[PDB]
Amino acid sequence: VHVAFYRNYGKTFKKPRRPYEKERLDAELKLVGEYGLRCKRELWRVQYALSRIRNAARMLLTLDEKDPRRIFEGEALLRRMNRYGLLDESQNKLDYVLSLTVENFLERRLQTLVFKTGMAKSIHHARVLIRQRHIRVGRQVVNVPSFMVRLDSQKHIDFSLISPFGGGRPGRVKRKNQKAAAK
Amino acid sequence: GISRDSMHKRRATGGKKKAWRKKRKYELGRQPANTKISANKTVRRIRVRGGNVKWRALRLDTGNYSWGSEAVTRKTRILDVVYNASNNELVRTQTLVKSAIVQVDAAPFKQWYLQHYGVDIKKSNHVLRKIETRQKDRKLDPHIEEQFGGGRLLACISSRPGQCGRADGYILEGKELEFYMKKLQK
């Protein structure tokens, strides 16, 4: 027996059933370009997560209103959606979960947030800044654009303290140019 | 060796069973003792499952036999084998197995009867009184009395000589004695 064998893993996306739907392709390209995604796999992963959440909500809504399982899991799901900013306090019913779109999840990406608060001139600039270790959520440097920012952590986004845009120690290019200009 | 498993047997429907494992040591069997009557006593020691002990009697001469009516047990000598229900051949070979009918020496029981009832089949006053008191309920089966004349008593072996190494038993009485006497009179 190899103990590593007991670790489990799972897939995070599925390929489209019909590869060459023109309307689907146009919509997907529009979303990818708007949010600066690297490929269709990221969009399909977000769609997979949204489908899972919507299926859970739909399953719960089938149960009786007084069912303890429905109460427990619905509260858990609503709290989860509220923590990540998907739903507003007024949106306090499982029904509003079914009205969630891929755009709602995409708007919670660290890349989209970094672009929106004004730390980047463009969504692609936000991507390159994040992957280059210039952004931190709290006191932790984050380099994953897919990072889903919670409501509480949204206001803590700032430049990394060890980066040129957040502290001192300019980049290697600037240091090299300064050294060259010293002569 | 000898095996007690059911693998080799047929199914209750009559179909054949195909082997799926070898013989196991926990379902073994061993050879019979085939104990006999001989002055050369020979009992073998067997180491069995769990480290326990069994006694294999090859030849026995004496046994521990009890008189049920009198509640007396004495060690006497086994004379011969007269009847065996399982197999007639076991009588010719004088095999000693449980439930076999044998003749045993009556001398110890005759001595006990003489000492207890003061009857053959100095003494103090108290002993005489005791014997007289015992004489009121002195009732003896006539068949046992006729047996005592020849010095031999019919008995049944109640022990398993091949397992415990002893040919113990009890003296036939009443209906059982009549049954076996009738079966022997032929």
């Binding site: 027996v1 103990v3 007991y6 670790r7 303890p68 109460i71 427990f72 509260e75 | -």
Partner: protein, 259 residues
């Protein structure tokens, strides 16, 4: 197999031990002792996993070989010694006395007890019969044998045993109206009072127990341990007092505590 198994795979360890899936390929196999393997808590788990005195297997062995841990007032140096229900675990160096009791979720909990409460334990009687020479005796479900027991004591009763003298100082008859704790099944660790007993010839007996909050549950006779006479247990119960809380109320309490 050709004989006794000496190993226990980690996935095959009882779930109430709460062993990590990736911690290793093996779990401590309980040794022979007063308690069954599935219904015990080896000292290695207590010292390493629970109390965290030892960070490793070797540290557990080192601690135990100093003769610093006592079970039922007797020093035990066996790491896999099976310590089970109602047992007393004492560490004189740290002035710690523990009693092994089931929590509402059915897992062994090291319940800290006072010095006075650490001098006795409860036992459940299996049967009473005559030994050699006609001497009566009874045996408990923790492997103990006691000669010349009180004639009133019978099977399924609870006896208060003084560890210092190893003598029965009191006993509780199994009857309706007694507070009991369930030691097996899905209801293990719950505490309530017996309501009625159903007896079926040639079959297990059913016991109906009512929780302090009015909740009702039923279990088999062998899973019921009497804790006192009436409604007051003879020993201090762990936190929660054997009251099973539904997941909804547990979540409500957790959310209230968060704020």
């Amino acid at each position: 197999a050709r004989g006794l198994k000496k190993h226990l795979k980690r996935l095959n360890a009882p779930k109430h031990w709460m062993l990590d899936k990736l911690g290793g390929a093996f779990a401590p196999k309980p040794s022979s002792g007063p308690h069954k393997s599935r219904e015990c808590l080896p000292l290695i788990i207590i010292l390493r996993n629970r109390l965290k005195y030892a960070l490793t297997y070797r540290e557990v062995i080192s601690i135990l070989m100093q003769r610093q841990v006592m079970v039922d007032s007797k020093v035990r140096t066996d790491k896999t010694y099976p310590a089970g229900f109602m047992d007393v675990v004492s560490i004189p160096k740290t002035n710690e006395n523990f009693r092994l009791l089931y929590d509402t979720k059915g897992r062994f909990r090291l319940h800290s007890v006072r010095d006075e409460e650490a001098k006795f334990k409860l036992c459940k009687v299996r049967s009473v019969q005559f030994g050699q020479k006609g001497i009566p005796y009874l045996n408990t479900y923790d492997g103990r044998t006691i000669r010349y027991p009180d004639p009133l004591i019978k099977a399924n009763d609870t006896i208060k045993l003084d560890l210092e003298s190893n003598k029965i100082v009191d006993f509780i008859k199994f009857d309706v109206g007694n507070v009991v704790m369930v030691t097996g099944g899905r209801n293990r660790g719950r505490v309530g009072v017996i309501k009625n007993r159903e007896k079926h010839k040639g079959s297990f007996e059913t016991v109906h127990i009512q929780d302090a909050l009015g909740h009702e549950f039923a279990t088999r006779l062998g899973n019921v341990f009497t804790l006192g006479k009436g409604t007051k247990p003879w020993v201090s119960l762990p936190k929660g007092k054997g009251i099973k809380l539904s997941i909804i109320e547990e979540a409500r309490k957790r959310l209230a505590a968060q704020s």
